[PDB]
Amino acid sequence: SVNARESNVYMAKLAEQAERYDEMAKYMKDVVEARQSEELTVEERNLLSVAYKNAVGSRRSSWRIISSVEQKEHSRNAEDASKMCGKYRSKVEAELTDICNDILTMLDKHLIPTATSPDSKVFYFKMKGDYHRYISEFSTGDSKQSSAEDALKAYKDATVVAKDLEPTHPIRLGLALNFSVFHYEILNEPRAAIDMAKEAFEMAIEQLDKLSEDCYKDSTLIMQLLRDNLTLWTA
């Protein structure tokens, strides 16, 4: 009955070690779609995220490298070569679209509807915002507007639930981290990014003392990324 689950999870772990993430993602995808309304474990949930994050991560990184060369050529009036970069970028975009749509479908149909605890709901609402954001990174015109609006809503929805978590809860901080990034890079609203990140960070600092030895570094890891972004963003 639940034999296939233990086994897909074993394979997902195995593919992560082998660094074959499209396969890691397909294993974890098969866990999600099978589930009778049972919630993914913390361990599974993280594996799904790691797998999608890496599968998408590598295409995003190539996307950026390919774009930069495209604009390098465009500016050196080498038009024949510019178009070649463009055809190649589109191909990477097709892959990005597929992988993002795949995980977002799983979130809309399976993950978000079945989640109980404040933890899970924030976790999955944040994922959806993230993947809409990834689509927003390369999209144009009305695709961009659409995915921008769904990411925004997803982060808002996540923000609403997150108020039930302590200001130093790592899942609450991570949301503010990505939510502020969304504002700055996609919406081009530097003021609301700075505020959001500043708020999340100050609210956490106000409470670092009310934490224990074996728990505070998970928090500081992320409060640190928050400061690093603020430093970059503030002239």
């Binding site: 981290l177 990505n178 890079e185 992320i222 990324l225 690093d228 970059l232």
Partner: peptide, 6 residues
């Protein structure tokens, strides 16, 4: 260039 959650 801003880092998002690892």
């Amino acid at each position: 260039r801003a880092i998002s959650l690892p």
